[PDB]
Symmetry: D3
Subunit: 266 residues, 6 copies
């Protein structure tokens, strides 16, 4: 596993954004072979989305042939509601890049048949073959996507009931009223994520310190689904300073020297 | 993973039995496509077997096209010995249902060539393709089937030497004399179980509290093979009240509300 | 998992060597179907290599049709340097057996293109199909091959940066000067090892007690890659007396009686 | 140890206030034998102070013969700053009850001689003999008073350097600017609290869930100073619902049966 | 801490009895300076009482000048009920030795004033000065006396509410009906036991394996009150084979070398 | 607890020596009130003794009025053997400073009456009142003095049987032959060290990394006797870089900010 010990969130977004750009450009997407990108929502990727937009405007990357798939979406929340993941994605990303509407894949949290929705989503990923790079975040309780503690490490896209603690964390976007945040959400499973060619998790803040420790130093278990990365052949964790506070000295020492050159880019 | 927090063993058997019935009926087994069912022995499934028999007598299910495979069988114990798993199954189940003798698959604990026996068993499962629902229990030390601590999480059907503690637990059926219980037994491996489409573990009693905690809150490891369910995409654990005593408040809180409707059937 | 509790290193080598011999002879290798053997370097296998050489000289085994693959090799160290794994293997083994030069596969730690080297190595294993028996050791920090803590449990052959602690341990062969030991090394991944038909780990000494405990009693995690054996269907650990000091009484009791006959050969 | 499991902060405040009132009234304090109350500051005790004031105005208690000692104070914060513990204690309690000015004891965070201030504080406690009841809170990191992780369990009143997490936690009262929160504070040591006849800690909110678990279910250690209560012959922990989430079901169950009557004021 | 590793309960009884006899005889008690023996009830001490009686009848000890104090008694159980600790102590020991009626001390579980009964009990111990040897057992949950999980490590004689597991465990003596086992009991606290000159705990059976491990290898904590012995300058634990199963090989090894001579009475 | 995080053993020696010198000079010892220094042997204190001698020769301290008490001594080792602690203390310290022969206190490992030797040793400490500063080291297994795992935390000076790991560790000084290392030794108990006004432990090398972690981050337990310092009101641990590797980043961070000024002698 690769862990990139950075200091600031701004640095994390810059690093993470440059990485996505390098992968796309190295891949050389065409209409027949698009680059499939997995994407998250929340506060963590904000700097990354900003960096990417900056790079696109500078003519450094084009998304004309990039296909995207988002990790999840709230159930029952209106599409046009400012806090739906659909709104989030467009406001913060799509509205500023040249990605065509065909290439955008979001889970329909208002599908008449929830079960058909999840099944079709998996089918969509399969049709393109494989997600090349899946970017995401980690929850306070260690959940990846919305695979809350006790989710199967082999799970597929399905409807999931959120842990009260997650709703409380997410209530920031709902005027701090827990009663506002949806009790359920459609999410890609751990198995889905594991099928991706490369997984890149952004970790920012002290609230994620126990989660990061669980992912790096812990054992594989379904209570902290983020630990599934230990079984992934190409996992990367980009973190800032405060999120590494629960790690051992030797753990952070090892990674710091591995990435020494890799992060001096500034 | 789904955990059904129930109060009484009677409730567990009722829930578990109704689930098996719903799956079979929803499947609609025919002579060409039978429903393959995995089954355990011991004290835990007693209420389930009783419920099933009740439902069959009421004309709610028929086993005329259900194929069964049992988890294990003692080595060296005579078939007709009242405590052989062969005797157990017929006395407690088969003797009361309309399952034809062809559809019954039990491990021969007295096979001249133990190695050929296990290999043929695996072959038998393969010929039908896949076990649809595998029901089982959990040992005090967390063993699933007779996969004692240190059994490979990728293991196949083989001969296994029982842990002294297991023999002591099983001595209840041998007039409480440990010297009576067989030292070895043929058992399906963790890999075998994992190949099943759905796994349903019944957990009853305080003796299983540490085991249940290990399965739900613990990490995957071969010392408590029951933890292999964390890697299974369709695992269900039906428990009574005393078995949930080692869980965290939040863990039992989460599941109780998930199953709230699902268990109100009474 | 099988654990062979032995007393002395001499006993370990004897047991381990006899096992390799039995497997080869039972396999009956020919030019078209060779027996593929995985091999380690270090101090642990010394008695095993000696035993094997003794057995070959006695006409008990021939390596004329055995193909070998070594776990790793230092990067940047000259081939002819007495402490390169290439030198180690020939001095301690190849120089005394009848294995033809074609059948010897070692990682080129001085390849102009490191990435091509690792890829070709994997290809080499694939061409023969599958490694039949992979013998190895365990590091103080639990690393198998040079898959240091935090290596992916699904990893493939690649270049790896060694943990300072490993270099310190390996400095014994470099006149006790840490500055002498290479900072990097080419190594087969955990995924590579897992693809082998049977894995046999030799464990000798008190320095490996925490590692052995992690492998046998611990949970699967990438910090102690040796724990990957829990997911392997055919893993064997041969140990001496001092390495079992961190195990539980019951754990060593169980294995001692399982192998009672199996080790009385003396 | 007693743990009063209530649901809301309002209840915790009523139980706390009620318990203090009963101790005082049962004590029948006089000028020659006053009751000695140790007190905390922070968000936790807010409901308890409100209830105490109420009961006082209602003629249920008189602090005419009660001497108070506060746990801590910030170093270098002006005594008139609305956020100094001195201000907190007057604004929220002293300004509303009938306690003599000479009966109030507070650590002076602006003392020219810090060691002298602290020593004289312990000596002022000694002159009275002992603190009959010491009320307190618990920090996110499990700190009792400002005895941060790694504080001696036999510590006395001395100055302490506040952990970054505590400063961030306390920034709440300094308009969310950590830079405004004092870096140091004078606090009573663990040994000083252990010398009280009875200790009562108030735990509210999910943020203290880990602290509560460490206190109740953990072992004695100086990283979570709240663990010192396990050594106290008379410790009570009053908690709301969210703070008990990290506890085992059995643990909560026990305390629920235990305090059934004692918590039904209604 | 000394741990006497024996094989059988019979041996444990002989070592225990022998050790008590040697202390008394070495003490040379007189009416003006009696020996003070603290004693337990339950299945564990049965072999020790048998051996004590024997040695007495054989003229090896005289309890003429020995004062006894028992650890606990059930609240609300008739003194004449065959299962009251009073009955147990007479049936199994007092009725067979030469100890004066005035030298026997037992807690009255039917005392109208429970706090008074308990206080006077501590005062009766104080009048004699100190308990020279306090013999005891250990509960499945690690309880010493009836100091259930979460009992203060500095606790005194007081009433305690018995854990459901203890009641279920003790149902053995109430014809397996938990409803017949008293819900409360008067017991000496942890601090009271810590005040004895020497403490000797008897551990028998695999059911105590976890309690023994917590005692010997765990940390000091109030959930497993037997951990208080780590704080005692003179504690001995006499155990049989099954009770040591959860211990590390090294731990058992150490004690075996340590007590070699001391356990070879033969 | 204070932890001085330095980089090298040379620095640790300078900080240690400097701290001892300041205590003595600040104490202003006289013949009627001498300073009492407790001292250790082994490789760890080598740099501290060198620096003490230096400072002495430089006229910075006088041991004319300093009484010394050493922690331990080997049983059955000739007082003139170059490896006896007596020899160590003279060769490395006494032979170079101005301390009176009557001010030196050492345990006699060849005492005909071991209990008497040990008792009189505690009595000699009592006559002086108390040890003002007790300097020590830590064993790989976390032992303070020779209080091996499972030693009472309230232990006094007595004889102890050395753990095999300690003997192997100490073989360094007996030309690597464990058979030459004494099996027993007289040592001050945990309670004796806890009675010192201040304790200062020296930790050097990666081999002590686990001992340091147990001491700083672990819980109080008798398997790692160094954990007793958590109970000491005045304990300091001086460490080099390698010994801190098992600590959490946050833990090291805290101590670094804490000791910044205090470690910059330069
Ligand atoms: N909503 C999910 C991502 O789409 C989830 O994994 C999320 O990243 C996690 O809850 C962290 O959220 P944050 O970025 O707002 O901290
Ligand atoms: N015998 C096995 C099931 O066939 C085993 O898994 C069994 O379920 C387990 O030992 C639990 O037994 P119990 O149901 O008697 O408690
Ligand atoms: N060098 C590797 C084997 O090729 C590594 O796994 C090695 O076995 C391990 O470091 C143990 O070394 P040792 O045998 O020298 O103890
Ligand atoms: N500041 C101390 C109380 O005086 C401390 O114990 C406090 O209770 C703790 O930091 C928690 O603060 P809170 O009450 O604001 O949660
Ligand atoms: N009842 C107490 C002894 O008087 C308790 O310590 C007892 O030893 C423990 O409950 C174990 O009971 P057992 O001796 O019946 O196993
Ligand atoms: N022998 C004792 C010191 O007198 C012991 O505390 C010692 O410090 C410990 O065994 C470590 O030895 P070392 O100093 O040689 O590392």
């Amino acid at each position: 596993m690769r862990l990139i010990p950075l200091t600031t969130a701004e640095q994390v977004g810059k690093w993470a954004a440059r990485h996505i750009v390098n992968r796309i450009n190295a891949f050389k997407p065409t209409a027949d072979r698009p680059f499939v990108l997995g994407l998250p929502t929340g506060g963590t990727p904000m700097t990354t989305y900003k960096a990417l937009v900056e790079m696109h405007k500078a003519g450094q990357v084009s998304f004309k042939h990039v296909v995207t798939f988002n990790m999840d979406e709230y159930v029952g929340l209106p599409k046009e509601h400012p806090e739906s993941y659909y709104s989030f994605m467009h406001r913060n990303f799509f509205d500023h890049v040249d990605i065509p509407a065909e290439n955008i894949n979001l889970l329909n949290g208002n599908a008449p048949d929830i079960d058909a929705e999840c099944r079709q989503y998996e089918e969509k990923i399969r049709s393109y073959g494989k997600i090349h790079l899946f970017m995401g975040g980690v929850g306070n309780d260690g959940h990846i996507a919305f695979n809350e503690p006790a989710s199967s490490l082999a799970s597929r896209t399905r409807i999931k009931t959120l842990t009260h603690d997650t709703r409380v964390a997410n209530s920031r976007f709902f005027d701090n009223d827990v009663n506002q945040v949806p009790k359920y959400a459609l999410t890609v499973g751990v198995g889905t994520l594991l099928d991706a060619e490369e997984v890149m998790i952004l970790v920012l803040g002290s609230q994620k310190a126990l989660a990061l420790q669980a992912a790096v130093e812990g054992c594989v278990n379904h209570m902290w689904t983020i630990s599934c990365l230990q079984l992934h052949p190409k996992a990367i964790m980009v973190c800032d300073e405060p999120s590494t506070m629960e790690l051992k000295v030797k753990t952070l020492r090892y990674f710091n020297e591995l990435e020494a050159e890799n992060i001096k880019g500034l």
